[model samples]
Target: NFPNSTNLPRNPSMADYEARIFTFGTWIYSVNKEQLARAGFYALGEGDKVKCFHCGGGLTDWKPSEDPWEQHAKWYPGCKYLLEQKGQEYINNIHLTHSLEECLVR
Candidate 1:
């Protein structure tokens, strides 16, 4: 999860390359090969596709969070306390996010 988006389905290292390709063939109906290839993604072939190298799961299984704002709010207290502990000049040197309360206080 180095890039922070690779939450794998079924523990990684389950399928070998052949089975992965087979699963991808079954799962993907079509692919945007040209656009992906332009962005430096590997081109398998005209009708070819990729399964998740880590999880080997289908694309439909991928879950982007539904309630990210609520999740971010939970972290605000810790961020605000850390920033307040380090005074304004110290905080200002780094780009800091202001919570609603912090904005009102300012």
Candidate 2:
């Protein structure tokens, strides 16, 4: 299936920032839970997996250098909520940065 087209939260109960942030109460991952919540993700209480509130995109395999919003935009480009929050320019830039991440591999 395609990414969510609406700004509706897949987990309605996690629509609030605090609700999402609180989900990481006992988290021990390198990715900051506070920033994850700000980036629209809520911890699954399973390892380091986190799901976007609006698009429900799941991400794991935490990296110390990865920015939550950048990863969100990189992996869930079609997320409507992300589009609204970050704008296409910002999203496009994140995509560009990731592309550079690979291109610079050479």
lDDT of 1 at 43: 21
For model 2, residues 1-33, the per-residue Cα lDDT tens digits are 556767676778988998888888888899888
- At residue 82, what lDDT does model 2 achieve? 92
Candidate lDDT scores, in order, read: 0.31, 0.89
Output candidate 2 Cα RMSD: 1.3
In terms of lDDT, the best-performing candidate is 2
Estimate TM-scores for all models.
Answer: 0.21, 0.92
lDDT of 1 by residue, 1-106 (tens): 2211233323244324333333333334334333222211232333443223332222222123422122222232223322333444544433344445467787
Model 2: lDDT of residue 24 = 86
Number of the top-ranking candidate, with TM-score as the measure = 2
- What are the clashing pairs of model 1? none
